[PDB]
Symmetry: C3
Subunit: 299 residues, 3 copies
């Protein structure tokens, strides 16, 4: 029923541990999920949620990825890692028929936040139906610790029925090619980070949002309303020193961003793409901040 | 009649002065203005012009913002500062009914050029109707002086009547959600920086353009035709050292850019978004450069 | 017949030579070319191919540009250099009637990869019909050598007939203003870097792609499927140190990017804009990598 992935669904950080072999088990499932209130959609998912599970490795880690396809699936599924140096991002040999299972190993060489998605023809459809996720490759030593870590991805829903219409919705190839989505969604559904799973922090907390755009067509202008990003890893790269003091960051489709900020004032904060007509199409996130008032910063 | 804000309408720079309390008085006015020749539009404005007044403060400055709403206004108006660490950017407690007045104080902590806009439902409409501006927070010491400073913002007009049709134009909610504007405008109207207020500099002048995108939907690829930007503050951040020698800079909606360049050759220079079909929809700016010819640079 | 420019069509690199006068001869030709299989289009070209010839100079080089227009041409043609400090990028005095010839000289002052295009009204049409190219201004000393250098540009085709329809296609002004292209193309045509001229490298080679977007409307999210960019010159600037370890890079219309990467694993690699619905409209590139398998990186 609930396809929305929780933002707080984040693996524990890698410490100062040495490189190792890491096993990953991803299962591609097609299920009917809640897109909006009264509206259901035919989702293609990794592990039954949109986006797919956030993965967390170190540089030098050999990732042993297993991809199983559910028996009741109607489509061939794969996975393309942006962290991988492999033909098709390793999806060349991960074309899995419903029922079967394939496995490859790849080594992470570049630190940063990378997008993963299904790379089965047609790729734009598989992504749009919700088959996208992120893989974080932490550098040697790891990221400096913060109080809160969140996992947010932007996606497009190309439903045949118009926005506002209740009932069963299927993918529209016409809208896809026209690049005209009916719904813009954070983490799968409408109000996934609003009514369903609102982000929560306390006054004085440093928040790190692992943001990425599944797409598959439109770029995002990521902005937390009421906050300025202290540090931004542009395109989600953890090699070049980050940008400092940014209001809005351009995140391309298949791209990432590591946005860090300190919360100083209590209240409600809004996660939006600053193409704010999309906020009327479900692209709205809520960050509740509880604590004492800070009159020196805001009165 | 003339809603277009002049590019040369810039406050005098902050010197090396210490942090202080700065009062700001913004008045939200709805008035009929010239969108194009023969075409008028229902504008929602800050201080009667699009974009709103450019504000200029220092880091550590406590900004005392007063927002008055005109008695003849038909809408609730607010203001969201990207420079502010406050719920809704301070717009949570600046929802002003026509006739009333509210006031808050916030402290500027991050240097850079920040967008401000009305944040009253629906936000995309309020922005589109012309309620956007910029606030420059100068760092400790201030910006190095230049010969000319300009203030340019990009906006979209979602008129019900098609482009080319004369008469009274109103906002179209259908076009807004479709992200299909009839007009792309610099500083409010068509030919605002062309026929109305052309930019003017002399040979050898260093020019600084405080560029920002009101939007509310489309990003800009800022380019001055015939010039290369010497220094660009990406996303309008004045913390990280600027980029050097850039032709075209991606500016997202609700984002900024500080573009600096030296003018070496006399003639006409064109301010455009490099999505140059928009130049046929009013998104065109003129920079007249007068002086002697420089054959070593261009013959 | 074949309008597609080969990616391997790159001038030999500038060594450590001193600044000099460089002559450039560009001829604007209008010819019927293969857009897709069974589909032909009315192309406006520089030197008979899309994109135009890649030019290669040093900083301090005085570029003597000659622009000849073919006698059988039906349009006025010009050329706007982003590397030039000149009114209209030097296109102000390079408006050449079919049959005539004009010449100007300009000095390159800024290092980086710059876009060039025709700047004759209406500019968006001239670009869309294929009149765009790149000029690389190498810094003092030059770029570090790589094994392979490629030349790739993204363009839009606004055909009157829909995608899939065979026959003669002409430019549609309606689609242009609507920003709705039927075809997205790398280097002129559909399958230009796929079926026609596939990129080829060997295992262990460092590859440098001089990527740029002719446009004239849509931005690109450049991504090589199966590879991570080691170094990216953002907006194609060779002054500021490059970004490191990037998956997907936002390249604006009229903008550039110098993407470098090391190929470690044999197989097929895909050049795409990560707006992957465009990959169904011809925006697809192939990089064949031949050599021994590397099980440590990918198995
Ligand atoms: Cl899971
Ligand atoms: Cl004023
Ligand atoms: Cl040639
Ligand atoms: Cu799939
Ligand atoms: Cu991808
Ligand atoms: Cu308002
Ligand atoms: Cu905003
Ligand atoms: Cu031309
Ligand atoms: Cu240009
Ligand atoms: Er494990
Ligand atoms: Er479906
Ligand atoms: Er604590
Ligand atoms: Er106190
Ligand atoms: Er004051
Ligand atoms: Er109106
Ligand atoms: Er002087
Ligand atoms: Er002389
Ligand atoms: Er020569
Ligand atoms: Er034609
Ligand atoms: Er060798
Ligand atoms: Er071995
Ligand atoms: Tb704490
Ligand atoms: Tb002077
Ligand atoms: Tb070699
Ligand atoms: Y977990
Ligand atoms: Y603590
Ligand atoms: Y003033
Ligand atoms: Y002076
Ligand atoms: Y050659
Ligand atoms: Y060698
Ligand atoms: Yb993991
Ligand atoms: Yb099958
Ligand atoms: Yb609140
Ligand atoms: Yb001020
Ligand atoms: Yb009311
Ligand atoms: Yb001129
Ligand atoms: Yb050359
Ligand atoms: Yb003529
Ligand atoms: Yb292969």
């Amino acid at each position: 029923a609930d396809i929305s992935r929780e933002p707080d669904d984040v693996p524990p950080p890698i410490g100062k541990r040495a490189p190792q072999t890491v096993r990953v088990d991803l299962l591609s499932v097609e299920l009917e999920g809640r897109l909006a209130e009264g509206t259901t959609f035919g989702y293609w998912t990794f592990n039954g949620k949109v986006p797919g599970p956030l993965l967390r490795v170190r540089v030098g880690d050999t990732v042993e990825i297993h991809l199983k396809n559910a028996a009741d699936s109607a489509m061939i599924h794969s996975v393309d890692f942006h962290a991988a140096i492999a033909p098709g991002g390793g999806a060349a040999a991960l074309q899995v028929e419903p029922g079967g299972e394939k496995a490859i190993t790849w080594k992470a060489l570049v630190p940063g936040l990378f997008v993963y998605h299904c790379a089965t023809p047609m790729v734009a459809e598989h992504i749009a139906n919700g088959m996208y996720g992120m893989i974080l490759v932490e550098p040697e030593g790891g990221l400096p610790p913060v109080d809160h870590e969140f996992y947010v991805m932007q996606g497009e829903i190309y439903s045949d029925i118009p926005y506002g219409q209740h009932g069963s919705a299927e993918f529209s190839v016409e809208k896809l090619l026209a690049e005209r989505p009916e719904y813009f969604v954070f983490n799968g559904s409408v109000g996934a980070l609003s009514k369903l799973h609102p982000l929560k922090a306390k006054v004085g907390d440093t928040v790190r949002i692992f943001f990425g755009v599944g797409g598959p067509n439109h770029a995002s202008s990521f902005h937390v309303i009421g906050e300025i990003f202290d540090k931004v890893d542009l395109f989600g790269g953890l090699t070049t020193p980050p940008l400092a003091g940014i209001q809005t960051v351009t995140v391309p489709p298949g791209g990432a961003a590591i946005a860090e900020f300190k919360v100083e004032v209590p209240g409600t904060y809004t996660l939006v793409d600053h193409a704010l007509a999309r906020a009327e199409r479900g692209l709205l996130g809520i960050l509740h901040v509880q604590g004492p008032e800070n009159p020196d910063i805001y009165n």
